[PDB]
Scaffold this active site. Structure first.
Site, PDB file in Angstrom:
ATOM      1  N   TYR A   1       0.849  -1.176   0.000  1.00  0.00           N
ATOM      2  CA  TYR A   1       0.000   0.000   0.000  1.00  0.00           C
ATOM      3  C   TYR A   1       0.894   1.237   0.000  1.00  0.00           C
ATOM      4  O   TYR A   1       2.090   1.148  -0.265  1.00  0.00           O
ATOM      5  CB  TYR A   1      -0.971  -0.033   1.180  1.00  0.00           C
ATOM      6  CG  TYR A   1      -2.183   0.828   0.954  1.00  0.00           C
ATOM      7  CD1 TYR A   1      -2.819   0.846  -0.273  1.00  0.00           C
ATOM      8  CD2 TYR A   1      -2.672   1.644   1.953  1.00  0.00           C
ATOM      9  CE1 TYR A   1      -3.910   1.641  -0.492  1.00  0.00           C
ATOM     10  CE2 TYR A   1      -3.765   2.441   1.744  1.00  0.00           C
ATOM     11  CZ  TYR A   1      -4.378   2.436   0.520  1.00  0.00           C
ATOM     12  OH  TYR A   1      -5.469   3.237   0.309  1.00  0.00           O
TER      13      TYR A   1
ATOM     14  N   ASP B   1     -13.144   5.592   3.650  1.00  0.00           N
ATOM     15  CA  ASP B   1     -12.022   5.654   4.574  1.00  0.00           C
ATOM     16  C   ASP B   1     -11.195   6.921   4.426  1.00  0.00           C
ATOM     17  O   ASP B   1     -10.553   7.337   5.394  1.00  0.00           O
ATOM     18  CB  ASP B   1     -11.119   4.439   4.404  1.00  0.00           C
ATOM     19  CG  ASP B   1     -10.046   4.374   5.460  1.00  0.00           C
ATOM     20  OD1 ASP B   1      -8.955   4.933   5.239  1.00  0.00           O
ATOM     21  OD2 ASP B   1     -10.305   3.790   6.528  1.00  0.00           O
ATOM     22  N   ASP B   2     -11.188   7.540   3.247  1.00  0.00           N
ATOM     23  CA  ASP B   2     -10.514   8.824   3.114  1.00  0.00           C
ATOM     24  C   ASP B   2     -11.174   9.885   3.981  1.00  0.00           C
ATOM     25  O   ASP B   2     -10.492  10.772   4.504  1.00  0.00           O
ATOM     26  CB  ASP B   2     -10.506   9.266   1.654  1.00  0.00           C
ATOM     27  CG  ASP B   2      -9.593   8.422   0.794  1.00  0.00           C
ATOM     28  OD1 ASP B   2      -8.584   7.906   1.317  1.00  0.00           O
ATOM     29  OD2 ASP B   2      -9.887   8.273  -0.409  1.00  0.00           O
TER      30      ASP B   2
ATOM     31  N   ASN C   1       0.430  13.527   3.709  1.00  0.00           N
ATOM     32  CA  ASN C   1       0.826  12.148   3.460  1.00  0.00           C
ATOM     33  C   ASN C   1       2.251  12.038   2.924  1.00  0.00           C
ATOM     34  O   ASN C   1       3.047  11.286   3.500  1.00  0.00           O
ATOM     35  CB  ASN C   1      -0.164  11.461   2.512  1.00  0.00           C
ATOM     36  CG  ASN C   1       0.030   9.959   2.465  1.00  0.00           C
ATOM     37  OD1 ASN C   1       0.917   9.425   3.130  1.00  0.00           O
ATOM     38  ND2 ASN C   1      -0.799   9.271   1.686  1.00  0.00           N
TER      39      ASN C   1
ATOM     40  N   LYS D   1      -5.245  -2.107  -0.888  1.00  0.00           N
ATOM     41  CA  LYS D   1      -5.963  -1.842   0.351  1.00  0.00           C
ATOM     42  C   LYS D   1      -6.583  -3.112   0.902  1.00  0.00           C
ATOM     43  O   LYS D   1      -6.573  -3.338   2.116  1.00  0.00           O
ATOM     44  CB  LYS D   1      -7.033  -0.784   0.127  1.00  0.00           C
ATOM     45  CG  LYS D   1      -7.864  -0.512   1.344  1.00  0.00           C
ATOM     46  CD  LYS D   1      -8.763   0.672   1.122  1.00  0.00           C
ATOM     47  CE  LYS D   1      -8.052   1.960   1.439  1.00  0.00           C
ATOM     48  NZ  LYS D   1      -7.495   1.941   2.808  1.00  0.00           N
TER      49      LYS D   1
ATOM     50  N   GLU E   1     -13.181   4.464  -1.973  1.00  0.00           N
ATOM     51  CA  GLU E   1     -11.780   4.807  -1.803  1.00  0.00           C
ATOM     52  C   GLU E   1     -11.302   5.645  -2.973  1.00  0.00           C
ATOM     53  O   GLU E   1     -11.511   5.277  -4.131  1.00  0.00           O
ATOM     54  CB  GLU E   1     -10.918   3.550  -1.672  1.00  0.00           C
ATOM     55  CG  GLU E   1      -9.434   3.824  -1.560  1.00  0.00           C
ATOM     56  CD  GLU E   1      -9.086   4.702  -0.375  1.00  0.00           C
ATOM     57  OE1 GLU E   1      -9.779   4.611   0.658  1.00  0.00           O
ATOM     58  OE2 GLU E   1      -8.119   5.485  -0.472  1.00  0.00           O
ATOM     59  N   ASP E   2     -10.668   6.771  -2.658  1.00  0.00           N
ATOM     60  CA  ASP E   2     -10.007   7.618  -3.645  1.00  0.00           C
ATOM     61  C   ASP E   2     -10.989   8.126  -4.697  1.00  0.00           C
ATOM     62  O   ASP E   2     -10.768   8.002  -5.901  1.00  0.00           O
ATOM     63  CB  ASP E   2      -8.830   6.886  -4.286  1.00  0.00           C
ATOM     64  CG  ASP E   2      -7.626   6.811  -3.363  1.00  0.00           C
ATOM     65  OD1 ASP E   2      -7.123   7.870  -2.938  1.00  0.00           O
ATOM     66  OD2 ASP E   2      -7.180   5.695  -3.054  1.00  0.00           O
TER      67      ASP E   2
ATOM     68  N   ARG F   1      -8.843  10.538  -7.582  1.00  0.00           N
ATOM     69  CA  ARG F   1      -7.929  11.205  -6.655  1.00  0.00           C
ATOM     70  C   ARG F   1      -7.210  10.123  -5.859  1.00  0.00           C
ATOM     71  O   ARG F   1      -7.684   9.703  -4.805  1.00  0.00           O
ATOM     72  CB  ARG F   1      -8.680  12.171  -5.752  1.00  0.00           C
ATOM     73  CG  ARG F   1      -7.792  13.099  -4.955  1.00  0.00           C
ATOM     74  CD  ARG F   1      -8.613  13.954  -4.010  1.00  0.00           C
ATOM     75  NE  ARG F   1      -9.230  13.147  -2.967  1.00  0.00           N
ATOM     76  CZ  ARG F   1      -8.633  12.817  -1.827  1.00  0.00           C
ATOM     77  NH1 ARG F   1      -7.402  13.235  -1.574  1.00  0.00           N
ATOM     78  NH2 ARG F   1      -9.270  12.071  -0.937  1.00  0.00           N
TER      79      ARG F   1
END
Ligand SMILES: NC(=O)c1ccc[n+]([C@@H]2O[C@H](COP(=O)([O-])OP(=O)(O)OC[C@H]3O[C@@H](n4cnc5c(N)ncnc54)[C@H](OP(=O)(O)O)[C@@H]3O)[C@@H](O)[C@H]2O)c1
Ligand SMILES: NC(=O)c1ccc[n+]([C@@H]2O[C@H](COP(=O)([O-])OP(=O)(O)OC[C@H]3O[C@@H](n4cnc5c(N)ncnc54)[C@H](OP(=O)(O)O)[C@@H]3O)[C@@H](O)[C@H]2O)c1
Ligand SMILES: NC(=O)c1ccc[n+]([C@@H]2O[C@H](COP(=O)([O-])OP(=O)(O)OC[C@H]3O[C@@H](n4cnc5c(N)ncnc54)[C@H](OP(=O)(O)O)[C@@H]3O)[C@@H](O)[C@H]2O)c1
Lengths: 556, 556, 556
Positions: free
Chosen positions: B89, B255-256, B395, B160, B232-233, B142
């Protein structure tokens, strides 16, 4: 799929596969070059079916058709369910199981023995389908009054499961018939070389109990806690013991105990629409202290309590007779199950005197004792109360305590008769025609099972069976009630089943019993979306197309 | 099974198949004649793994190992999860997705496009496993701050999902990674001939919304309403819009938005154990009005309300800065999402002045703006409040608003630092060693997903993420807290995940959220029975034997 | 088929599956949403392939591609076979087998051990394909001069089988690579923990012979007596012993013994086109009494007899030197294999003196002794006979008895040079350019195997290898002969293979060796119909339609 899709009865459509379906499935050439509808296949099956003489031959035809083309099998059944219910299930399935190994050609169901304890998960893995909702397990110890048939009893779950789908709408691919072979006590089968069974005496005690514990545990491990498990044709002791044991652990129910009760109470509540009074002002005499009698009495006490009657005064309306007379103060043999409905009264010799002693408004006969309802009894019944209720529920037409014509004559055409075996219409004095309804367990378990499977109901309390009885009693038309018909015609049972399911769904959602989370607003459409239909599904592959700029092959 | 059991990564054990297993599976000869343990296979994989130089080569090795032997893949991962989480990841999966089509050899996951609207049920039927519990869908718009990677983003769900199983205990065979390819706006990929994608601009508007509606409907039709679906994303707008849309319809979570919030609030609650005070007496400055910042602020307001603080006074403790300064009275661009945390104050130019204006006890940096935390800022922070909290959560280690050493020097070793990227230990004056913890989303979603899948939780409200943050904050030892480590070491994350699951299970059973009916008395053992272990299962067939009088072959 | 058609390298087309094929195969969604040609897939593979530095990495890339998409693998190979033959086969496959267990990720082929004696039929049943024509079995005892590699030698049959399909046209789905693991004597592998092998010393004697007897019996029982079985990389003793044992029982041939002979004699016959004379007026000196040398000498004696020379006088033209000097009257160690070519002459110390003693027209070096061909030798060669023939056939470029440039200088550009290892072009005095041809076994076994498999030739006598040598010698153009190139360029080998097959087909039909009964009139088209091409097959289902009066569904 290929050749394997024609050996699968759930997928095999026979000559109803279109040419396109045959080409896409890789089975072109394996089918004759005729393209039929399910109507033409039904016509072929019917023409071959009517050419048999014994009902066992028709049963064998239908069972082979089930092994060949299941959708055509259920098309045959739902074609006229009133004429195929006697063949696929009682009474014909009884003589089928009696001569099972004789005509036994293709094994159906799942045979789990006592010597498999510890390895039932693997045997459940032997079953092809893994999405199983219903499981009709049988023991073989008490089948249709024929007695211990042992492993020959596999026709009973299989047959019964047909009624789950033909009568109700349960997807037959989600149904698994099991036979728990713990041996047999039928000495005729212990020496029969054609006996497809285990050939030693019954294993009883803690070994049998552990076998059934592991069976329930394994069935719910593989198929989920929502797997409806119906116990069928167990011994009285075992029937009630296991019913009370797995009542609230699993989605278990026993139709010999609870379906009988539900259909008898449904008949009684329907007769209430003829007598035009309340259940409170009825006193009931039972002609048996048996597995069916106790269940009917308990559900009847529940129905009386629902009308606003205390438990003791409700119980005091049930009088039972068991081979010795009225169950009374510590008489000679009353176990704790007969103690409940014991009346505080002097002992009575026989039924025919306690009918005069306590004049009942409704007599129920469950003893398989032919002729127990005498001319004396029905005469004094019609004399005591106007419009009395007679329920000769004994299953074999031979064993019926009373016939339709006898009851209707002696009661001067004024008695609501109902039976467990079909008595056809009765004409009498002054052109009074009566259609004595047949109390059939198939009114109960198909719709109840359909609603339980639809909503994922975790447990089946007695209230579901009581409201099922109420719905069945409401199913009867006023016109049919004018003819003494206490139950709806079986030609409508499918709809009846639906109307039960929805109802037993509503209850389960208002008592937090259903597990299907996104509770449907329109529960009728929800249950209808799960009702299995015999119509053929299309096996063609959907071939759509992307716009001709995202699907172009790159040649760079 | 035969040759097909060696091409199945969930079943393939490689040379760990015993001789008996090879003979029983019909694969003898297909494996070299050496019988290894998973330890020796792990040693081979490690020896081949350490011989690579770039992290992309190690990622490719691990992904090929996943396609070959999944139990050995997760043995590799759980062998040292702290060293393989950066490879499988973020950050390595990012450069992997950047060069996906280059090294792309074996397709993983499920690619569902916009041109498939109406036929998603069939595409879900393409997936081999039919018992799916988790679904990590991605959009590709993203990814990891790399931006629009389009269909190259398939490494993100796949990667993930590895953390679902390596970090948590989610059975990887019940996990399905999806990529919704609606096109891409990355012009670099629209002309890349190696782009394994759809090669037109993003479909947006009602077509995209209907595609996602049908995706959720189809996923829950095939796998059930209990199928956990992690988004996700996605783009900020789409992320929040779809989160609020399918929040309460499905078991969806993003989760973001929510894992970031949970892990940031977990860090803050852990720092509360160092500051030795209550969350009520903290004022928070955010260095972004973003997707992560809004989530952290909302969960922080919830945590303040849980401590007994009204909603308005709790919100009045959050100050945010978005590229223009403090969000204030109708300043220039505040959409309704920034309106909530808008303070009624004169406008401020930059962060470095509003830190002096409203002296905060805890500053949180989420803007991917490197160096936003100046020496000035941290100095005045350590001056205003004793023991201040700095969260440089950006990040990329490059984008971190502050480094560990900078914060620890300027705060004279008196500031709780935490970051999103790993900063290793820091030695300073007077031998003060600090281990700046790394706030990793992997602390949140593995245990949360494990508990949701275990209990069949129907929906994931914010309270689950708050109690997850509380459990994570309780996971940190006093010894680790003495070293400024705000999060538990990743070498324990598996246990951490377990301890979250059980907790998010208890909640779900006390708020009637779980659907697993027979509620386990010992929820810890229940969740442990579902934690997937890399240990090999035995493929031998159990061969028991009936007593040698019921299994004898009849020769009559 | 579904997900299983993407894990099958013979069926998997990767992203070359069209949308219609994906929908019809049930694999839509499993592939990224791009539709490529085999050209674009080839470009991706090449771009990823050129980014490696060591040849072992390229070998690993190609082998993974073979495990993924076999038609793309052979598209890569036949794309430029001259550059991928060194990678898939010698010399790179040698260092691959040396480090096999290190990079070993996916087992390929069939591993049959000594401890499987009696059960080889089942192990052959483990192989997925049941229509097997070719079987390249290996022993691991003598691989590429690297010596005993044991079970690591599986790369040699696999690799060699690629040349069956890339060079020839053998359908790779009909090829089975076997490794007979009887242990190993390599002490380095007996202690290597990564050794994917049997880890005891070689089983030899009657146990090994019975193992191979049963292997041949089982291979021909399952796949037929026409199954071509090539023995590869056996020990000299075992190689020749088993060649003479199963020569006339099965369709067996040994390419180390017979392919070497065929390609060397092909080179000699091609050089005859430069010397412009007959083979009768040539005398040959061999620089080895070895496995290759004996084969070359025997096929050369056969070629001389074919030209009208008696056996004794033909043998008297072959002089050999084995570590002691010329093989002469009972010298010191001559076993019965060297006795045949023993000359009746005084003993000679070394090669460099027997070249002067018996002045040869053609010297052949097979000893893996580097520098055995001195400046003295080649000088006196060019002095004795005008235009002499030098064959430095030693496989490692290091072990070559002479280089191209050395021979071409010392012979003043007047000597036909040929080698086993590639020496690139040579420019000299007066602009004389020479392209020293490389005698590669790949000129022989692909076309021979193709013709044998096409015609079902029952046995492979030496005459097939001689006519193969003749066809190869005829393959060389006059232009290439002007440049000293003795063998056709490998870029044409496929056609060469075809032209050999047809020829070895004609022979087999005129000597009653072929078993394909309806003998094709046009054998070229017959063999071309069996030449495997890397082009993708269409996986769509043919959907035709009956006239719309025989396909109508009957609704009666
Ligand atoms: N839907 C339906 O129509 C339906 C469903 C199920 C059953 N049935 C019928 O109802 C009957 C119920 O039998 P079961 O198997 O459930 O119970 P059972 O175990 O057969 O018990 C029968 C009971 O009848 C009593 N009895 C026996 N002989 C008698 C006599 N001469 N006079 C009065 N009572 C007597 C016995 O009392 P002791 O305890 O003294 O032996 C016994 O308890 C069956 O025969 C069946 O035909 C109908
Ligand atoms: N667990 C973790 O450690 C974790 C998880 C997720 C994210 N993160 C990090 O946190 C950041 C959150 O980004 P996101 O994608 O969630 O939100 P985003 O959509 O990237 O929004 C970033 C926000 O920062 C503001 N901003 C931009 N430049 C600024 C400047 N010079 N000064 C002050 N504010 C500025 C912008 O305000 P405007 O509205 O004016 O543009 C924008 O709203 C990411 O960069 C990521 O690196 C960490
Ligand atoms: N197509 C091709 O290009 C091709 C194919 C196959 C092989 N080759 C090459 O040809 C060679 C053949 O070897 P092989 O494995 O087939 O046979 P081998 O078993 O290696 O035998 C080699 C022979 O050379 C003799 N020898 C050893 N040292 C010598 C020296 N100093 N002077 C003279 N003779 C000496 C030995 O005689 P003793 O009996 O006294 O030991 C031995 O019999 C291989 O090295 C290989 O590189 C080329």
């Amino acid at each position: 799929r290929g050749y394997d899709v024609t050996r699968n009865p759930h997928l095999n459509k026979g000559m109803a596969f279109t040419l396109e379906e045959r080409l896409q499935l890789g089975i072109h050439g394996l089918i004759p070059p005729c393209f039929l509808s399910q109507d033409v296949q039904l016509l072929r099956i019917m023409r071959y079916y009517e050419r048999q003489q014994s009902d066992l031959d028709k049963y064998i035809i239908l069972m082979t058709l089930q092994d060949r083309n299941e959708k055509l099998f259920y098309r045959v059944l739902t074609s006229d369910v009133e004429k195929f219910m006697p063949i696929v299930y009682t009474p014909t399935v009884g003589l089928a199981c009696q001569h099972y190994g004789l005509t036994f050609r293709r094994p159906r169901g799942l045979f789990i023995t006592i010597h498999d304890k510890g390895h039932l998960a693997t045997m459940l893995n032997s079953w092809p389908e893994d999405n199983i909702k219903a499981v009709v397990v049988t023991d073989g110890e008490r089948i249709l009054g024929l007695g211990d048939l042992g492993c020959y009893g596999m026709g009973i779950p299989v047959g019964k499961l047909a009624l789950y789908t033909a009568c109700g709408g349960v997807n037959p691919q989600q149904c698994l018939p099991v036979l728990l072979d713990v041996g047999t006590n039928n000495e005729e089968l212990l020496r029969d070389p054609l006996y497809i069974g285990l050939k030693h005496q019954r294993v009883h005690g803690k070994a049998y109990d552990d076998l059934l514990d592991e069976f329930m545990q394994a069935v719910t491990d593989k198929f989920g806690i929502n797997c409806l498990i119906q116990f069928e044709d167990f011994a009285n002791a075992n029937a009630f013991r296991l019913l009370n044991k797995y009542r609230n652990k699993y989605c278990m129910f026993n139709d010999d105990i609870q379906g009988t009760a539900s259909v008898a109470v449904a008949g009684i509540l329907a007769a209430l629409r003829i007598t035009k009074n309340k259940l409170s002002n009825h006193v009931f005499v039972f002609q048996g202290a048996g597995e069916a009698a106790m269940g009917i009495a308990h559900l009847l006490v529940m129905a009386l309590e629902k009308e606003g009657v205390p438990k003791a005064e409700a119980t005091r309306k049930i009088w039972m007779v068991d081979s010795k007379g009225l169950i009374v103060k510590g008489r000679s043999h009353l176990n704790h199950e007969k103690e409940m409905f014991a009346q505080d009264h002097p002992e009575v010799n026989s039924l025919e005197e306690v009918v005069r002693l306590v004049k009942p408004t409704a007599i129920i006969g469950v003893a398989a004792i032919a002729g127990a309802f005498t001319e004396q009894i029905l005469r004094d019944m019609a004399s005591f109360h106007e419009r009395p209720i007679i329920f000769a529920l004994s299953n074999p037409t031979s064993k019926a305590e009373c016939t339709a014509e006898k009851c209707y004559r002696v009661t001067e055409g004024r008695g609501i008769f109902a039976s467990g075996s079909p008595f056809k219409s009765v004409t009498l004095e002054d052109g009074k025609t009566f259609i004595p309804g047949q109390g059939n367990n198939a009114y109960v378990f198909p719709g109840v099972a359909l609603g339980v499977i639809a909503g994922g109901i975790r447990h089946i309390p007695d209230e579901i069976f009581l409201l099922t009885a109420e719905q069945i009693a409401q199913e009867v038309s006023e016109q049919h009630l004018s003819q003494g018909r206490l139950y709806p015609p079986l030609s409508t049972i499918r709809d009846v089943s639906l109307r039960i399911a929805i109802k037993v769904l509503d209850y389960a959602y208002k008592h937090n019993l259903a597990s299907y989370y996104p509770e449907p607003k329109d529960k009728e459409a929800f249950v209808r979306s799960l009702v299995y239909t015999p119509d053929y599904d299309s096996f063609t592959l959907d071939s759509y197309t992307w716009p001709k700029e995202a699907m172009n092959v790159q040649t760079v």
